[PDB]
Design an enzyme around this catalytic site. Structure first.
Site, PDB file in Angstrom:
ATOM      1  N   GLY A  30      40.328 -34.204 -65.708  1.00 38.56           N
ATOM      2  CA  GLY A  30      39.467 -34.123 -64.643  1.00 38.56           C
ATOM      3  C   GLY A  30      39.728 -33.060 -63.483  1.00 38.56           C
ATOM      4  O   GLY A  30      39.955 -33.523 -62.378  1.00 38.56           O
ATOM      5  N   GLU A  51      37.487 -30.656 -67.981  1.00 39.71           N
ATOM      6  CA  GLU A  51      36.871 -31.173 -67.185  1.00 39.71           C
ATOM      7  C   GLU A  51      35.349 -31.517 -67.687  1.00 39.71           C
ATOM      8  O   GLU A  51      34.792 -30.443 -68.668  1.00 39.71           O
ATOM      9  CB  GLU A  51      36.500 -30.175 -65.891  1.00 39.71           C
ATOM     10  N   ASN A  93      43.672 -37.370 -61.943  1.00 43.22           N
ATOM     11  CA  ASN A  93      43.086 -38.398 -60.827  1.00 43.22           C
ATOM     12  C   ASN A  93      41.827 -38.871 -61.453  1.00 43.22           C
ATOM     13  O   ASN A  93      40.940 -38.007 -61.534  1.00 43.22           O
ATOM     14  CB  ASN A  93      42.592 -37.623 -59.430  1.00 43.22           C
ATOM     15  N   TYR A  96      37.375 -44.747 -62.262  1.00 46.53           N
ATOM     16  CA  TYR A  96      37.756 -46.114 -62.583  1.00 46.53           C
ATOM     17  C   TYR A  96      36.999 -46.686 -63.782  1.00 46.53           C
ATOM     18  O   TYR A  96      37.598 -47.475 -64.715  1.00 46.53           O
ATOM     19  CB  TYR A  96      37.493 -46.808 -61.337  1.00 46.53           C
ATOM     20  N   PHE A 155      40.196 -40.121 -50.294  1.00 48.14           N
ATOM     21  CA  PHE A 155      39.126 -39.622 -51.175  1.00 48.14           C
ATOM     22  C   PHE A 155      37.816 -39.542 -50.622  1.00 48.14           C
ATOM     23  O   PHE A 155      37.479 -40.015 -49.463  1.00 48.14           O
ATOM     24  CB  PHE A 155      38.949 -40.911 -52.346  1.00 48.14           C
TER      25      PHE A 155
END
Ligand SMILES: Nc1ncnc2c1ncn2[C@@H]1O[C@H](CSCC[C@H](N)C(=O)O)[C@@H](O)[C@H]1O
EC number: 2.1.1.184
Length: 236
Positions: A30, A51, A93, A96, A155
């Site tokens: 990503g 990506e 990074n 979640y 963030f």
């Protein structure tokens, strides 16, 4: 989701803990808008950015105008096929909602010897918890370390909880390829406390004593391997 870390100042702090060198080939999970990707191509030998967002691949590309040691593939990390005869490390990074799937994919379906990830604070803690299955499956393949805390304000959009920078280092597997099934079963039964399905009352006791486990609510990975070992001995 897409939570970018765009402050150059914060990016440098985080890179401070990432010890990747000029000769390492890197796969970034990503690349987003290319903020970490820009630092990785300057720090590392070559970088392959994976990506999913078709647009972001372009943006990443624009940010890397002055660099050649990279490529940007518009693929889904979950369906990506990693090299099998090459030394490479991983950075990412990650979202979640699919952290579990991502970690399982890169630890069990890739041979990266070193992996750096930014994940949710609590998620990182569960990874070191010997009471959960994922933790036990992962610890047989890699050493896990929480390197630092990444404040949610770094963030944007700003997530609800903080994140952590973690490091995974490949090691000689503690579970032989022939024990994968038996280890899988054992792990699941043990985390669910279904002791009777893997240990007779006496076997259970002897195993804990043998493993030196006083607190059944606090065991090290080593103590767990001991248990899995006795389990094998009792059914070879
Ligand atoms: N399955 C998947 N495969 C590849 N990339 C994915 C993915 N799911 C999400 N992503 C991408 O991973 C990123 C999560 S946010 C990380 C942004 C970037 N590192 C920065 O801080 O600038 C996004 O760019 C998102 O599009």
């Amino acid at each position: 989701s897409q939570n970018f870390i765009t402050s150059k100042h914060n990016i440098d702090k985080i890179m401070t803990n990432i010890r990747l060198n000029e000769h390492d080939n890197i796969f970034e999970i990503g690349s987003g808008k290319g903020h970490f990707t820009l630092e990785l191509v300057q720090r590392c030998n070559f970088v392959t950015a994976i990506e999913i967002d078709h647009k972001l691949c372009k943006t990443t590309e624009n940010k890397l105008v002055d660099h050649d040691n990279f490529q940007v593939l518009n693929k889904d990390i979950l369906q990506f096929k990693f090299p099998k005869n090459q030394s490479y490390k991983i950075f990412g990074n990650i979202p979640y909602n699919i952290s579990t799937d991502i970690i399982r994919k890169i630890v069990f379906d890739s041979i990266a010897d070193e992996i750096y990830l930014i994940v949710e604070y609590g998620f990182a803690k569960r990874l070191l918890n010997t009471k959960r299955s994922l933790a036990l499956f992962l610890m047989a393949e890699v050493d896990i370390s929480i390197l630092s805390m990444v404040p949610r304000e770094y963030f944007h959009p700003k997530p609800k909880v903080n994140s952590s920078l973690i490091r995974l280092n490949r090691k000689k597997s503690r579970i032989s390829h022939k024990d994968k099934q038996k280890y899988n079963y054992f792990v699941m039964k043990w985390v669910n406390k279904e002791y009777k399905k893997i240990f007779t009352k006496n076997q259970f006791n002897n195993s804990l004593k043998h493993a030196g486990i006083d607190d059944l609510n606090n065991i090290s990975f080593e103590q767990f391997l001991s248990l899995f070992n006795s389990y094998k001995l009792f059914n070879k």
